[PDB]
Design a protein around this ligand. Sequence first.
Ligand code: HEM
Ligand SMILES: [C-]#N
Length: 153
Amino acid sequence: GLSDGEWELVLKTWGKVEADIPGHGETVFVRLFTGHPETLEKFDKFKHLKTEGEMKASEDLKKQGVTVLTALGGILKKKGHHEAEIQPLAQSHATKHKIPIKYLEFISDAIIHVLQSKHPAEFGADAQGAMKKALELFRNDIAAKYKELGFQG
Ligand code: HEM
Ligand SMILES: [C-]#N
């Protein structure tokens, strides 16, 4: 996993996300959908949004952003002891939503990009490295659960 030092950097960084969860959540989805349009086909409630302007204006899309970052924040706060919180999530994503593990890689990249754009001077190589390692741990644990459930991880 990560050292206590690395977890400290991930939590301080997350401190910046918590100051505007809706703003960061909205940007992560606009990057994700514009960057990897196939991901949009998994959200039956958003498929009709075709332009960047329509996405930016969607309060429903902003609410989804809040849901995702709220859940992820709760997990990162566990510093690796997140067996309990990941289980339900792998379960719904694999079996109900049908999200390939690769889309979790796309959304992680989107998170890194938003942090770079919104906090360019404050999100340095140390904080970025730690944030990448935490998201990698998170994805690897989900992937492990997908395999347990009989899906490709
Ligand atoms: C950091 C990664 C993510 C987190 C923490 C996360 C979390 C959430 C949670 C908390 C919900 C609501 C409860 C549930 O249904 O399980 C949810 C709903 C959903 N998630 Fe994710 N998710 C992640 C990534 C993704 C990705 C990459 C996709 C699609 C490309 C996806 C698609 C969905 C869909 C289709 C739903 C239902 C939306 C609506 O309610 O119809 N998720 N996710
Ligand atoms: C999942 N959003």
